[PDB]
Amino acid sequence: ITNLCPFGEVFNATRFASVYAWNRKRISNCVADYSVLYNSASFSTFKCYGVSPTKLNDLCFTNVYADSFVIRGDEVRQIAPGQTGKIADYNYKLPDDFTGCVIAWNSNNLDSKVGGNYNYLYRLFRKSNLKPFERDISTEIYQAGSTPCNGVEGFNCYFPLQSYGFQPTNGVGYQPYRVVVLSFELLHAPATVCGP
């Protein structure tokens, strides 16, 4: 464990995932300075659960996972234990007993465009809610009624994904926010990601 953990490729990526197809990166065999991130004035959300951020430099884990995606600013509240709404329900679900940190910052300057950027998607329809940390990238037509759809969109036959419309003069609740979720995994197995 001499390498510095490769967080820059996650936090500084040019393009982020759509939330329905959220990205996961395993972090291992490296030294992470969590305090430097935490004492970054770069984040408007930095919320930890089951761990102290001011103590994370003291701890070793087996693996760390860094999940990332874009959502609306008024949806960042959903990326926490115990939440409901279309993001928690059908896109990205934390467990009630989550151990980890939720990090977010406004990305209007990168992710909005004049005329609207519609390349970021979310799942609007699903027969049931996601379980914690589930990922669903399927695109089957959602049968909202009792008539079958036969692969054709129409009345009560919905393609299940929807674009966000991010344009620069949106109010801040409708602006894009980049999110990184750090989860901390301790197995009965060596422990490869340490603080300094």
């Binding site: 005329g115 519609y118 969109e153 393609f159 674009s163 419309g165």
Partner: protein, 125 residues
């Protein structure tokens, strides 16, 4: 089945006006942000306008204040009022549902967008 029913184009003298009407079939104007592209001579695509969810509007700099987008939810219709037309406005105008939505994942002018056949507009000297 999903489609756009488009009307109101054709031929007009410079300085005249037209009004385009666009009515989705199999979905509604509430489902996505509505707008128009236009395909100018040379297969030159340009975003003309969009009515965003929040009620704000985008216009291309060359059409601002001459063209007005409006929407009547009860009629499931979006409108493009085209005043004081100019020869350089000549194009095939395409109503769009911007982005991905209940009508599917489609493309127009290189981006996510659901279009249909469009309406030619020809502005003479």
């Amino acid at each position: 089945q999903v489609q756009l029913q488009e009307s109101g184009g054709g031929s007009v003298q410079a300085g005249g006006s037209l009004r385009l009407s666009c009515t989705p079939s199999g979905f509604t104007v509430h489902d996505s942000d509505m707008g128009w592209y236009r395909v100018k001579p040379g297969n030159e695509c340009e975003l003309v306008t969009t009515l965003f969810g929040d009620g704000d509007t985008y216009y291309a700099d060359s059409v601002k204040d001459r063209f007005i987008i409006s929407q009547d939810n009860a009629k499931n219709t979006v409108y493009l009022q085209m005043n004081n037309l100019k020869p350089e406005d000549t194009a095939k105008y395409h109503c769009v549902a911007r982005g991905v939505g209940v009508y599917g994942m489609h493309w127009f002018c290189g981006e996510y967008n659901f279009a249909g056949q469009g309406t030619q507009v020809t502005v003479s000297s």
